[PDB]
């Protein structure tokens, strides 16, 4: 790629992201005074572990589905073979969702948007995975310290997804070339806006992987203790991507 095509790639990624956000950033910031009362928080904490897991699993499936659309809209992704399309989504989808969580994070009061209002991490105590919750909140705290623009989150999450080191890629070189162009795009936009300082502050790739594997771990614990719940009440896309016990992704991609 030459320079003018890199700048074209920057706009293409920013637009693909814009069209595939679960909510506009405005909508998330207009709601910041809308906070769960002490009684609604006690309601969340008195809920059973399995109902809370189901409501979070449902919420994650919606977020993941917008990430699939982002991938379908992302320049060059549909050109990869279906096997690498699925390998990339299987590994990266939760990661992009983890990065995207910071838009719904309010670092003043340390609350997150969840089912219509903002609450702190004590909302999720019924999950019984307080370590993972703390890590997500801290991760989201770190990303918010960097004051990402929407364009930056667009470019960063594109690289989070288009990772040519994912085990199982059949056209590894074709993914590396796409990855290189997106990296060029990202770094060009950072340079043009005088934001290269954030390069040293981005989370290591082992942190995003750590959060994901912890998600799979705590969920496998939960599913062991409640196997019918996951079978009966968890969204199919969520079970495919994560549980012990490629086809919904297949159809999401075909459509
Ligand atoms: C809810 C939320 C948490 C809390 N966290 C606990 C449960 N979860 C798990 O993974 C649990 C850990 C293992 C199983 C479930 C996450 C889903 C969420 C942190 C955070 F930083 C942001 C959010 N909310 C959003 O990001 C959000 C919500 C609605 C719309 C949009 C948009 N656009 C974004």
Strands 117-119 and 111-114: antiparallel
How far apart CA 188 and CA 136 sit, in angstroms, is: 29
105 beta partners: 112
Residue 118: count of CB within 10 angstroms of its CB:
21
Q: Cα separations (Å) of 122 from 36, 111, 149, 233?
A: 11, 10, 28, 24
How far apart CA 159 and CA 7 sit, in angstroms, is: 16
Closest to 157 (Cα-Cα) out of 148, 146, 168, 167: 148
Query: Which residue has tokens 């019984």?
Result: 128
Residue 147: count of CB within 10 angstroms of its CB:
10
Count CA within 13 A, CB hemisphere, residue 41.
13
Residue of 133, 139, 203, 233 to test ligand 1 pocket, by largest number of atoms within 8 Å of CB: 133
For the chain, the domains span 1-255
Contact 159, 182 (CB under 8 A): yes
Contact 196, 190 (CB under 8 A): yes
How far apart CA 110 and CA 32 sit, in angstroms, is: 11
Whether ligand 1 lies within 6 angstroms of the CB of 124 is answered as yes
> If you measure from the C-alpha of residue 192 to the centroid of ligand 1, how many angstroms do you get, rounded to a whole number?
32
Count CA within 13 A, CB hemisphere, residue 87.
17
> If you measure from the C-alpha of residue 220 to the centroid of ligand 1, how many angstroms do you get, rounded to a whole number?
19
Measured from the Cα of 139, ligand 1's closest atom is 21
Report phi then psi at 63, rounded to 5.
-60, -40
Whether ligand 1 lies within 6 angstroms of the CB of 59 is answered as yes
Contact 222, 43 (CB under 8 A): no
Count CA within 13 A, CB hemisphere, residue 160.
28
How far apart CA 13 and CA 18 sit, in angstroms, is: 8
How far apart CA 96 and CA 158 sit, in angstroms, is: 8
Contact 50, 124 (CB under 8 A): no
Whether ligand 1 lies within 6 angstroms of the CB of 215 is answered as yes
- Residues 6 or more apart whose CB falls under 8 angstroms from that of 147 comprise none
> If you measure from the C-alpha of residue 102 to the centroid of ligand 1, how many angstroms do you get, rounded to a whole number?
9
How far apart CA 217 and CA 242 sit, in angstroms, is: 9
DSSP-assigned letter for residue 33: T
What angle do helix axes 3-18 and 150-161 make, rounded to 10 degrees? Answer: 100
How far apart CA 52 and CA 48 sit, in angstroms, is: 6
Method by which the model was determined = X-ray
Whether ligand 1 lies within 6 angstroms of the CB of 64 is answered as no
Q: Which helix or strand (DSSP H or E) is residue 10 part of?
A: helix 3-18
> If you measure from the C-alpha of residue 51 to the centroid of ligand 1, how many angstroms do you get, rounded to a whole number?
15
DSSP-assigned letter for residue 62: H
Query: Which residue has tokens 């009362």?
Result: 37
What dotted CATH number matches 1-255? 1.10.565.10
Token pair of 213 as six digits: 């594997």
Nominal resolution in Å? Answer: 2.4
3-class SS at 73? helix
Strands of the sheet containing 105-106, edge to edge, are 105-106, 111-114, 117-119
């Amino acid at each position: 790629a030459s320079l003018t095509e890199i700048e074209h790639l920057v706009q293409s990624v920013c637009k693909s992201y814009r069209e595939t956000c679960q909510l506009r950033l405005e909508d998330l910031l207009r709601q910041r005074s809308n906070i769960f009362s002490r009684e609604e928080v006690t309601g969340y904490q008195r809920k059973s572990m399995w109902e809370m897991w189901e409501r979070c699993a449902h919420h994650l499936t919606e977020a993941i589905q917008y990430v699939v659309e982002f991938a379908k809209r992302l320049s060059g992704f549909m050109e990869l073979c279906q096997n690498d399309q699925i390998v990339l989504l299987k590994a990266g989808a939760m990661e992009v969702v983890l990065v995207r969580m910071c838009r719904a994070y309010n670092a003043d009061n340390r609350t997150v948007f969840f089912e219509g209002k903002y609450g702190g991490m004590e909302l999720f105590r019924a999950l019984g995975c307080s370590e993972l919750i703390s890590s997500i909140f801290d991760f989201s705290h770190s990303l918010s310290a960097l004051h990402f623009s929407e364009d930056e989150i667009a470019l960063y999450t594109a690289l989070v997804l288009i990772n040519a080191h994912r085990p199982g890629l059949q056209e590894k070189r074709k993914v590396e070339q796409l990855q290189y162009n997106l990296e060029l795009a990202f770094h060009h936009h950072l340079c043009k806006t005088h934001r290269q300082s954030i390069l040293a502050k981005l989370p290591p790739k082992g942190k995003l992987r750590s959060l994901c594997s912890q998600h799979v771990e705590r969920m496998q614990i939960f599913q062991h203790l409640h196997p019918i719940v996951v079978q009966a009440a968890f969204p199919p896309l969520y079970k495919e991507l994560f549980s012990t016990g490629h086809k919904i992704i297949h159809r999401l991609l075909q459509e």
